[PDB]
Every structure is written in C-alpha cells, then in structure tokens.
C-alpha cells in the first residue's frame, strides 16, 4: 500500500478505520472490510444492536486513545473488539432504558482498562487477552442488576438451581445450528447474519473462514454426542465458543499442520463441553457465561503450547492470518 | 526524626508502633497516630470490635515476625492492616462463642501467609496486594460455617437466589451515607466513627482525606443513579469500596493530576457497581463480598496503568502520601 | 542403578514405568513400587475404579508423549498423577454409561494440557501445579451434566442452597477417619486401601508416610474442633486434603525442621477448614470441591515461602523425598 496515502489521513478517518478493524478483531480478523461486513451482518439483523456495536467499539477505542495506548495496538483494533461485544451484550440481555447508551459507553470504556490489565499481566507469557475484557466488564456491569434496578433483566436471565424436553434432531438442527453458531459470536440469532460473518472472514482469510465453519460444527455435534436438548444446539448456543476456538487455534496462534489441527480439535470439543459447565456454574444467579468457555479453554491450550515440542506456536506479536503465518515460516 | 531516639527503642514499643501503622494502613496511611485514631473510632463504636481489631492486627504482625518477614515490610504496617480487618469481620458477621478470639488469631495469622503469597505473586508487576489477604482468608474461614458449626452466622448471612422496597432519598441518606461509607471500611455502622476516621486520615494526608470523602460520595450517588434501594445507600454499603478506590487512586499509586483524577473517578464508580455484582454473586451462599469489589476494580486499574502514557503511575516501592509523591516528582 | 540396564529398555516397559510413577506422584512419591501398590489398594477396593485409574494415568501420559513433553517430566510421572485422579473421579460421581471410558480418556488427556499450562504459568515462581489439572479438567467435564445428559449424576450430586444430625464421636470415628482420610485422596472409601496406601508411601519415604498419617489426623480433629457432624469425619472427608498438605509441606517443598513443621501444621489445619468452605461454595450446583482445598491452601503457603526467612523452602526442580532433601542440605 502506497506510503503517500498517509498524506490523505485525518484523525476522523483513522479513528473510523481503527473502529472497523476493532470489529474485525472480534474474530481475529485485522481487516477493515471484514469489520465493515460484520457491522453489515449485525445491522441486517437489528439496527439497534448495530448502533450499539458501533458505539461500544467507538467508546473503547476512544478511551484507549484518551489514555494514550500505543498507537499500533489501537491501529490493529485490539482495543475495539471487546467494545463491540460490550455494546451488543447489554441490549441483548437487558430491556431498553434511556440510560442504555450511557451504560454501553461505560461498558466499552471499562473493556479498554481490562484489555490493558490483561496485556500487562498475560504479556509475561506472550498469551493474548482474547475476549476476557468483554466478559469480565459485562459480568461486573450485569451481575448487580438484582440490587441496582436501573435496568431490568430480560427473560433469558432467570436464577435457578440446576437440575436434569430433549426435542428432535433434523436437517434444520444442522443448517440453523451451523450459521447461528457463527452469528451467536456477536449475539446474532440470524442464519443470514452468520453467512455474512463467514463471508466477511473469507475476505481476509480462507483458512480462518473454514475454521469458523469447523468450530461451529464441532461445537454443535459435541453437544449432540453429549445429549444436549436439540433447541440450544439448533440456536447455535454450542457453536459460538467453538467458532472462536477454531479460529484462534486454526493457524493464527499455531502454525497450521496435522498436529496443530488435532490440537485445535481438542480446544473446540472442550470449548463446547465448557459451555455446559459455565452455564451451570452461573445458573444460581441466572447469568450468561458469554465467551468464558472459549477464553478458559483456549488460554489453557495457549499456555500449554510452549511445553509441547510437537506443537509449533506462533509468537503472538507476530501472529497474523494463517496464510501469512505459513508464508513467513517457509521464509 | 533524631536518629538517637533509636537508643530508646524496645521490642515491645516497636511492636506497638508496627501495630498502629498496621491499622493506619487499612486506608493506606503509614502513620501511628492515624492508626491510633482508627482504633479510637472503633472503640468509640464498640469495645468488643476494638479489642478484636487490636488482636487481629497483633496476630498478623507477630506471625510475620515469627516467620521472619523483612523488617521494613513489618515496620510499615503492611502485615498488620489485613489482620485489623480479619479481627473485626468475624464478630461482625458471626455470633459470639468463646472460641471467637482463637479464630480471630487464626484469621489474623492466615492473612500474613496470603500477604506474603500475593507480594511474591503480584510483585512481578509491582502491583500491591491491597486487602485481598483479608478477603481470601476470611472467606475461607467463613464460607464453611454451614458445615462446621462451631460458630453461628448472624442474620446478615442468609442464602438466597437473587431476585428483583425502594425507600425515600432524604438529607439523612447523604449525611449518614457519607460517613458510614467511611466507617464501613472497618465494619463501623457509626457516623461519628466515620468522622473520626476522616480526621485520622487528615492527620497524615489532606488529599487522602478528601479522596476518602469523594469516594464515599461517588459510591453513594453511583448506587442512587443505578436505582439501589435507599437503605443500603444510607448505611454506607455502597461507599466503603469506593472510599478505598478513592484513596488508592487519588495520588498514592498515581501522581495526582486532572487525568489521574478522571482515572480515579473511573475506579470509584466501577467499585460501587462491582459491589452490587459481587453481592449477587455470593448471595446463593449468603456471604458478604467484603472489599472484593475494591480489590478487583483497583487491581484492574493498577495493572492497566503501565499501558497508558497519559496516566502517570507511582512506582509501588516508592509510593507514599499524595503530598510526598508530588514533592518527589517536582524534584 | 547399573547404567547397562538401559540396553534392556523398550518403549512399552518404559511407558509402564512412567505410568506407575505417575500413580505414585498422586501423593508426591516418585516410585514405581509405590504407584504399583497404590494400584493394588484401588483394585482391592474396586476393579472398575482400578481399571479406570490405569486408563486415566495411561491417557494422560500418552497424550504428553504424543505432544512431546520433555522426557524427564514424563519419566518422573508428573504427567500421570492428575490422569490417575481424572480416571477415578468420573465413575465415583457419575453412573456408568458405555461412553464412560471414552470420557475418562478425554479427562485424562485434558489434565495433560492443564499440567503444561500450569507448569508454564506457575513456573515463573517455582511453584508446582499440584492436582489443579485434575480438579479444573474434572470440574469442566462434570459441571455441565445438568445440560448435557450423556451421563447421569449419582446421589452425591444434589444442588442445594447451604443451611445449618451431629452424631456421636467414638473410637470408630478415629480409626475409620484416619485411614479413609488417606484412602479418600483417591476416592477409596476403604480402611484397608488406606492402610495399603500408607504402606506404599512408607516404601519410598518414612517421613512422608508419617505426614500422611498426621495430615489425616489433623484434618479429622480440626473438623471435630470445628463441630462438623461425625459422619463426614468418620468417612475421612476432612482428612484427604490435609493428607496432601502434610506430605507436600512435611519435608518435600520445605526442609524438615521444627519451624517448617509448624508451618506444615498451619497448611493442614487450614486445608480442613477450606474443605468446608469450598464444599459450601459449590453446593448450589451440587458439585464436589475435590482437592481444591489442598491446592488453594498449599499454593498460598508455597508462594509465601520465599518471603519468610525462618522458612527454608526446597527449590522445586530439586525437591525429592524428605530424606533425600535433608541429605543434600547436610552436603
Ligand atoms: Au469504519
Ligand atoms: Au468510516
Ligand atoms: Au473507515
Ligand atoms: Au490478531
Ligand atoms: Au470501515
Ligand atoms: Au443503540
Ligand atoms: Au442499544
Ligand atoms: Au453429531
Ligand atoms: Au458430527
Ligand atoms: Au500502638
Ligand atoms: Au502502644
Ligand atoms: Au506505639
Ligand atoms: Au502505602
Ligand atoms: Au500507637
Ligand atoms: Au474481642
Ligand atoms: Au471478639
Ligand atoms: Au446522586
Ligand atoms: Au451526585
Ligand atoms: Au507400571
Ligand atoms: Au508394567
Ligand atoms: Au513397569
Ligand atoms: Au515430587
Ligand atoms: Au509398576
Ligand atoms: Au474402567
Ligand atoms: Au469406569
Ligand atoms: Au479432636
Ligand atoms: Au486431636
């Protein structure tokens, strides 16, 4: 890309580009068009969620600039993706109140703190923060809803002690399950949004698009093998963590080969199992696990990589697309 | 201070001074008179809680000396403050049994282990342990009360699944809320104790006394903005975490300026929100969050500081009063 | 041992030796005969649990070799012991289904990931992973049982909010409590299995055998002092965490003397108290704490050791039997 295009830059267009890469990075895709198309998929499903994704991405990005995060970290969208999710999560789980937008901005800003926390903390081992800033901030802003009534929880939020119908697996289970598994990465209960999302990843990386598809499928059929009722599976609730596992493990943080593929398959399966685990863990307070399943399991596999000679890890500060990763190895 | 006064020292008066600085350090005040006045505020509210604060401070300090902690860490009260709290927490939440004093000594001694754990662990990033030793030890000694009946929980301890009256905000809400917010840092449901506490901090640092006041107010009105019932707010239950946030962030661990002030305001607000969050999280087992809200949120902001160019952190091994901090910067 | 015996080695006998040391290491005993005798104790109680211990040890060991863990870590059984436990835990808590063996192999394989994670993570402070890989993997594979019905929980698994009969202490309380405390380290509700286990440790280390006995007793009487009902105490449910505390602290990770003995006694008592704590913490979801009590408390004491001049820690990469440890100090 012509170095002279830098004469054309202005803080507003540069901020706008940081924001769209921010959104791309929700699925590890450092690409403006990918992020632009993620926004398109969300806006396709809901205008309200779309505006809130944008505001959350904008809130977190701006906060990072206000505090003076290193320019390259901001330019790569690493202070945007947790803000995208922080923005969608709130109106997904809670009913609208006028304060909703203020609260989204707050949740966005808070993710930026936690991203910096975790880059400082996890950086000693070269391990990425993933979506932990989004999960930890949103939990902190959501758990207290029963005591702090500004917002009112939706019907998805229902405290209960866990206990042990099953439904019927059909072709629909698989087609809906697949693409909603991708869509549910950003709380998008929408087959077409999921398709758009896969296309969006394809633009930046073909291998990462395939692993998104594989992850969703592995999560889905893991849950079926494990005798989940059909309804959650069809809704892609067992795909989205495994989607993220697939993309992270499938050539981004490890060099793609047969061994690292098997390793990736490990994360993906356990991501789906951890989804049932964390959902149960938080059920007494009625709260969603979000992407905690993907975070915990992928952190375990990431931390473990340097101990396994047969598993070629990519150095995190270098880690680009699976295609780029292979091309720098062969060099 | 005349170096010859060292000829006058004796292990008992030196231990006594370690203990009073220990108590001062509950609110980051490395000052014997501050600690002496904290004791005075507690004894003003309750003789039983006062003796137990002293015994807990004494138990933790002595254990540190028995194990051979570095003299300067002990001399600065860093092995006392968690013991002060460990001592008060037990008779605050549980009914009296003769064993109570033994258990306080045990809780005090345990905090010293955990302080050393966390200084070793968190020390790699220059992050302070705060009151995590007190919280983790007390949780470990309290959670098991339903299975181990030596002690009997008070009526504040009542397992329930969370669920969604509101009361009436008055002038009393604000005056009681303010000073009980300070008092509740040490479980002191007492307006005058809170005043005494603010005076005690003022003796060592004017800026830290103001931030104690600001923290309590920010916590209070955050909870009101968030539609908390009035009763918890009036009782200062939403101030005390934010008091600690305010003091830590307001010039002690960051150099006081407009940007670090805004940063501090961030911790304080989120400290109050995290108070609702952690209270809900532990409600199925009926247990108090203690200062976990302040610990988690302040840890996040502390870990994040080195990533933010616009936020001037003080090196922790140097960090004194906000006044001293400014005076060494200008040098 | 004659260096020429190396000519006789074959991958299958070497794997077999890795597996038996793996089992020995459940109680820190790097000894093939110790592990062989642990297997004997289990098979004495239950053939089904014995086969499953072996399969879990085999699954974790093989996975480590497949991924290329450093040979000496594997040769020392450090990638076996969490697999032993991962294997027993599943049929102890859940009813049989044909998939049980597949799931055990999965749990075994997962422990190996987490062991590597934690050796990388905790290695920066020279702190051992202990049985955290077993606990974290098994929790992840167990918690989700209410949502993923392949397996069906046994009657030990019963979600309830905690609440506040007492039974009668007799000689039986003490004899059964003692040896089941040892036996319950590996989920063996069997006095003779516990005896066998103590003998097995004695083969490798007399001091570690005594600390196993002391730990079990300290845990037992701590729980009685704390007014536990008699039934859990008799069943050794308050010994097994303290057994592990005793062995770890009694000369393995610290050089055995009077001060480190008192230190060890600290871990052991708090291990029993933490057992009530974590049992309550997980009761809303009906889940066992496993050895989390021992892990948390022993981690605290381990991390704290380098801060205490009066407490002589052994460097972890050197740490052998208490007897060997003393013999290298005197050199
Ligand atoms: Au944009
Ligand atoms: Au734009
Ligand atoms: Au743009
Ligand atoms: Au990336
Ligand atoms: Au764009
Ligand atoms: Au919106
Ligand atoms: Au919205
Ligand atoms: Au399937
Ligand atoms: Au399948
Ligand atoms: Au004193
Ligand atoms: Au004194
Ligand atoms: Au004194
Ligand atoms: Au200080
Ligand atoms: Au004093
Ligand atoms: Au007392
Ligand atoms: Au007392
Ligand atoms: Au207000
Ligand atoms: Au206000
Ligand atoms: Au063997
Ligand atoms: Au063998
Ligand atoms: Au063998
Ligand atoms: Au060992
Ligand atoms: Au053997
Ligand atoms: Au079996
Ligand atoms: Au089995
Ligand atoms: Au006893
Ligand atoms: Au006893």
Contacts of B221 (CB under 8 A, 6+ apart): none
**Which of A279, A283, A301 is closest to A235 using CA atoms?**
A279
Ligand nearest to the CA of C35: 23
Residues of chain B that touch chain A, judged by Cβ-Cβ distance less than 8 Å: 124-125, 161-164, 166, 223, 225-228, 232, 263, 266, 270, 273-281, 283-284, 296-297, 299-301, 303-304, 306-311
Which residues in chain C have Cβ-Cβ distances shorter than 8 Å to B150? Answer: 225-227
Rounded to whole angstroms, the Cα distance separating C43 from C49 reads 7
Q: Are B66 and B210 in contact (CB under 8 A)?
A: no
- Method of determination is X-ray
Contacts of B240 (CB under 8 A, 6+ apart): B181, B182, B183, B184, B185, B216, B219, B291, B294
C-alpha distances out from residue B8 to B3, B33, B61, B76, Å: 10, 19, 21, 19
Of A117, A124, A153, which is closest to B304 when you measure between CB atoms? Answer: A117
Q: Are C157 and C93 in contact (CB under 8 A)?
A: yes
Rounded to whole angstroms, the Cα distance separating B313 from B247 reads 14
C221–chain A nearest CA distance, Å? 32
Rounded to whole angstroms, the Cα distance separating C143 from C135 reads 11
DSSP assignment, residue B105?
H
Rounded to whole angstroms, the Cα distance separating B221 from A287 reads 26
Taken in order of first residue, the domains within chain C and their CATH numbers are 1-331 (1.10.3430.10)
Cβ–Cβ below 8 Å for A120 and B278: no
Tokens 């160019």 found at: B309
C-alpha distances out from residue C98 to A164, C94, C104, C224, Å: 19, 12, 11, 41
Q: Are A160 and A287 in contact (CB under 8 A)?
A: no
Rounded to whole angstroms, the Cα distance separating A268 from A210 reads 13
Residue B136 half-sphere exposure toward CB, CA atoms < 13 A: 22
B97–chain C nearest CA distance, Å? 12
Of C223, C232, C273, which is closest to B140 when you measure between CB atoms? Answer: C273
Q: What is the CA radius of gyration of chain B?
A: 19
Rounded to whole angstroms, the Cα distance separating A318 from A313 reads 11
Rounded to whole angstroms, the Cα distance separating A299 from A307 reads 14
DSSP string, B129-155: -TTHHHHHHHHHHHGGGGT-TTS-B-T
Tokens 């345990």 found at: B110
Distance B177 CA to ligand 18 centre (A): 12
B63–chain C nearest CA distance, Å? 10
Distance C37 CA to ligand 21 centre (A): 12
Residue A312 half-sphere exposure toward CB, CA atoms < 13 A: 14
Backbone angles phi, psi at B151, to 5 degrees: -105, 160
DSSP assignment, residue C251?
I
**Which of A41, A153, A44 is closest to A89 using CA atoms?**
A153
Q: Are B177 and B233 in contact (CB under 8 A)?
A: yes
Residue B5 half-sphere exposure toward CB, CA atoms < 13 A: 5
Rounded to whole angstroms, the Cα distance separating A301 from A293 reads 13
SS3 C100: helix
Would you say the C-alpha torsion A284, A285, A290, A294 has a positive or negative sign?
negative
Which residues in chain C have Cβ-Cβ distances shorter than 8 Å to B121? Answer: 125, 303
Q: Are A216 and A210 in contact (CB under 8 A)?
A: no
Rounded to whole angstroms, the Cα distance separating A181 from A236 reads 4
Q: Are B56 and B187 in contact (CB under 8 A)?
A: no
Tokens 């915990």 found at: A296
Q: Are C243 and C181 in contact (CB under 8 A)?
A: yes
Contacts of A144 (CB under 8 A, 6+ apart): B226, B273, B274, B275, B276, B277, B279, B280
Q: Are C295 and C130 in contact (CB under 8 A)?
A: yes
Rounded to whole angstroms, the Cα distance separating C276 from C143 reads 19
Q: Which two tokens stand for residue A156?
A: 């998805």
Type and span of the H or E element at B302: helix B292-304
Distance A13 CA to ligand 3 centre (A): 6
DSSP assignment, residue B249?
I
Rounded to whole angstroms, the Cα distance separating B108 from C75 reads 42
Q: 10 Å Cβ neighbour count for B232? A: 18
Task: Classify residue B77 as left (phi > 0), alpha (psi -120 to 50) or beta.
Answer: left
Q: Are A290 and C48 in contact (CB under 8 A)?
A: no
Which residues in chain B have Cβ-Cβ distances shorter than 8 Å to C280? Answer: 143-147, 285
A201–chain B nearest CA distance, Å? 30
Type and span of the H or E element at C159: none
**Which of B152, B149, B69 is closest to B109 using CA atoms?**
B69
Rounded to whole angstroms, the Cα distance separating A36 from B247 reads 43
Which residues in chain B have Cβ-Cβ distances shorter than 8 Å to C270? Answer: 110, 140
Contacts of B11 (CB under 8 A, 6+ apart): none
**Which of C215, C177, C190 is closest to C294 using CA atoms?**
C215
Q: Which two tokens stand for residue B201?
A: 């901090």
DSSP lists the bridge partners of residue A298 as: none
DSSP lists the bridge partners of residue A153 as: A94
Cβ–Cβ below 8 Å for C150 and A226: yes
Residue A160 half-sphere exposure toward CB, CA atoms < 13 A: 10
Q: Which two tokens stand for residue A224?
A: 């079926």
Neighbours of C, requiring at least 3 CB pairs below 8 Å, are A, B
Would you say the C-alpha torsion C61, C67, C69, C70 has a positive or negative sign?
positive
Preferred mutation among B147, B155, B157, B163 to probe C, highest tally of C CBs within 10 A: B147
| Secondary structure of chain A as H, E, C letters | CCHHHHHHCCHHHHHHHHHHHHHHHHHCCCCHHHHHHHHHHHHHHCHHHHHHHHHHHHHHHHHHHHHCCCHHHHHCCCCCHHHHHHHHHHHHHECCCCCHHHHHHHHHHHHHHHHHHHHHHHHHHCCCCCCHHHHHHHHHHHHHHHCCCCCCECCCCCCCCCCCCCCCCCHHHHHHHHHHHHHHHHCCCCHHHHHHHHHHHHHHCHHHHHHHHHHHHHHHHHHHHCCCCHHHHHCCCCCHHHHHHHHHHHHHCECCCHHHHHHHHHHHHHHHHHHHHHHHHCHHHCCCCCCHHHHHHHHHHHHHHHHCCCCCECCCCCCCCHHHHHHHHCC
DSSP lists the bridge partners of residue C254 as: C313
Cβ–Cβ below 8 Å for C280 and B109: no
Residue C162 half-sphere exposure toward CB, CA atoms < 13 A: 28
SS3 C89: helix
Contacts of A84 (CB under 8 A, 6+ apart): A22, A23, A26, A38, A53, A56, A57, A186
Q: Are C29 and C84 in contact (CB under 8 A)?
A: no
DSSP lists the bridge partners of residue C313 as: C254
DSSP string, B30-73: --HHHHHHHHHHHHHH-HHHHHHHHHHHHHHHHHHHHHT--HHH
> At how many Å resolution was this determined?
2.4
Q: Are B195 and B257 in contact (CB under 8 A)?
A: no
Give the ranges where B68-190 is alpha helix by DSSP (H): 71-75, 81-93, 100-122, 132-142, 171-183
Rounded to whole angstroms, the Cα distance separating C29 from B86 reads 37
Rounded to whole angstroms, the Cα distance separating A93 from C111 reads 34
**Which of C55, C61, C53 is closest to C77 using CA atoms?**
C61
Q: Are A253 and A279 in contact (CB under 8 A)?
A: no
Rounded to whole angstroms, the Cα distance separating A310 from A76 reads 30
Of A161, A278, A304, which is closest to C113 when you measure between CB atoms? Answer: A304
- Name the burial class of residue A271, with classes exposed (0-12), middle (13-18) and buried (19+) by CB atoms within 10 angstroms of its CB: buried
Which residues in chain B have Cβ-Cβ distances shorter than 8 Å to A129? Answer: none
How many beta-carbon pairs under 8 angstroms link A with C? 110
Range C107-120 burial, b when 16+ CB lie within 10 A, else e: bbbbbbbbbbbbbb
Rounded to whole angstroms, the Cα distance separating A22 from A36 reads 10
**Which of C66, C55, C1 is closest to C23 using CA atoms?**
C55
C273–chain A nearest CA distance, Å? 23
Cβ–Cβ below 8 Å for A141 and B273: yes
DSSP assignment, residue C328?
H
Distance B51 CA to ligand 12 centre (A): 16
Contacts of A246 (CB under 8 A, 6+ apart): A211, A212, A214, A215, A216, A218, A264, A267, A268
C-alpha distances out from residue B160 to A150, B197, C160, Å: 22, 34, 10
CA C7 to chain centre: 34
Backbone angles phi, psi at C160, to 5 degrees: -155, 150
Preferred mutation among C122, C270, C307, C312 to probe B, highest tally of B CBs within 10 A: C307
Preferred mutation among A225, A300, A313 to probe C, highest tally of C CBs within 10 A: A300
Q: Which two tokens stand for residue A220?
A: 């889905």
**Which of C117, B116, C178, B2 is closest to A301 using CA atoms?**
C117
Preferred mutation among A232, A263, A278, A307 to probe C, highest tally of C CBs within 10 A: A307
The counts of H helices and E strands in chain C are 15, 0
Backbone angles phi, psi at B325, to 5 degrees: -55, -50
Rounded to whole angstroms, the Cα distance separating B315 from B305 reads 11
Rounded to whole angstroms, the Cα distance separating A176 from A178 reads 6
Write B40-43 long-range contacts (CB < 8 A, 24+): B40/B196, B40/B200, B41/B183, B41/B186, B41/B188, B41/B190, B41/B192, B41/B193, B41/B194, B41/B196, B41/B197, B41/B200, B42/B88, B42/B186, B42/B188, B42/B193
Rounded to whole angstroms, the Cα distance separating B138 from B136 reads 6
Of B66, B120, B148, which is closest to C306 when you measure between CB atoms? Answer: B120
Rounded to whole angstroms, the Cα distance separating C288 from A224 reads 26
DSSP assignment, residue C308?
-
Contacts of C64 (CB under 8 A, 6+ apart): C73, C74, C79, C112, C115, C116
SS3 B319: coil
Which residues in chain A have Cβ-Cβ distances shorter than 8 Å to C113? Answer: 266, 300-301, 304
Cβ–Cβ below 8 Å for A273 and C148: yes
Q: Which two tokens stand for residue A239?
A: 């795909």
Interhelix angle C292-304/C240-247, rounded to 10 degrees, is: 30
Q: Are A144 and B280 in contact (CB under 8 A)?
A: yes
Q: Which two tokens stand for residue A132?
A: 């932990």
Q: Are A81 and A248 in contact (CB under 8 A)?
A: no
Q: Are C226 and C167 in contact (CB under 8 A)?
A: no
Rounded to whole angstroms, the Cα distance separating A173 from A151 reads 34
Q: Which two tokens stand for residue B164?
A: 């969604």
How many beta-carbon pairs under 8 angstroms link A with B? 110
Tokens 């170096």 found at: B3
A279–chain B nearest CA distance, Å? 14
Nearest CA in chain B to A161: B161
Rounded to whole angstroms, the Cα distance separating C254 from C146 reads 42
Cβ–Cβ below 8 Å for A308 and C69: yes
Q: Are B118 and B316 in contact (CB under 8 A)?
A: no
Distance C147 CA to ligand 25 centre (A): 22
Which residues in chain B have Cβ-Cβ distances shorter than 8 Å to A280? Answer: none
Rounded to whole angstroms, the Cα distance separating A50 from C18 reads 55
Give the ranges where C126-205 is alpha helix by DSSP (H): 132-142, 171-183, 191-204
Q: 10 Å Cβ neighbour count for C168? A: 8
Q: Which two tokens stand for residue B145?
A: 């009360």
Rounded to whole angstroms, the Cα distance separating B321 from C160 reads 48
């Amino acid at each position: 890309r012509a170095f002279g295009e830098q004469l054309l830059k202005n803080p507003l267009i540069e901020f706008c580009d940081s924001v769209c890469r921010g959104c791309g990075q929700v699925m590890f895709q450092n690409n403006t068009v990918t992020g632009l198309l993620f926004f398109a998929g969300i806006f396709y499903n809901s205008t309200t969620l779309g505006v809130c994704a944008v505001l959350g991405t904008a809130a977190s990005t701006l906060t990072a600039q206000l505090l003076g995060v290193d320019k390259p970290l901001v330019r790569a969208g690493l202070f945007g993706f947790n803000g995208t999710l922080a923005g969608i999560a709130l109106p997904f789980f809670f009913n609208y109140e006028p304060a909703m937008l203020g609260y989204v901005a707050l949740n966005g800003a808070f993710t930026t703190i936690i991203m910096a926390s975790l880059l400082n903390f996890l950086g000693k081992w070269g391990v990425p923060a993933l979506t932990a800033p989004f999960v930890l901030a949103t939990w902190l802003l959501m758990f207290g809803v029963y005591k702090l009534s500004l917002f009112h929880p939706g019907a998805l939020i229902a405290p209960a002690l866990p206990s042990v119908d099953m439904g019927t697996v059909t072709g629909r289970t698989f087609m809906e399950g697949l693409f909603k598994g991708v869509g549910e990465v950003m709380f998008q209960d929408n087959i077409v949004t999921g398709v758009i999302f896969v296309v969006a990843i394809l633009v930046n990386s073909r291998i990462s698009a395939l692993f998104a598809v594989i992850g969703s499928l592995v999560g889905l059929c893991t849950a079926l093998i494990m005798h989940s009722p059909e309804t959650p599976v069809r809704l892609g609730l067992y795909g989205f963590n495994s989607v993220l596992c697939g993309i992270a493990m499938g050539g981004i943080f490890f060099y793609l080969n047969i061994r690292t593929f098997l390793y990736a398959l490990g994360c993906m399966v356990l991501g789906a199992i951890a989804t049932g685990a964390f959902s149960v863990l938080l059920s007494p307070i009625g709260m969603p696990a979000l992407t905690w399943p993907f975070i915990v399991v992928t952190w375990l596999f990431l931390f473990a990589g340097s101990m396994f000679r047969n598993i070629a890890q990519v150095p995190t500060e270098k880690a680009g697309t699976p295609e780029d990763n292979l091309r720098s190895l062969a060099i």
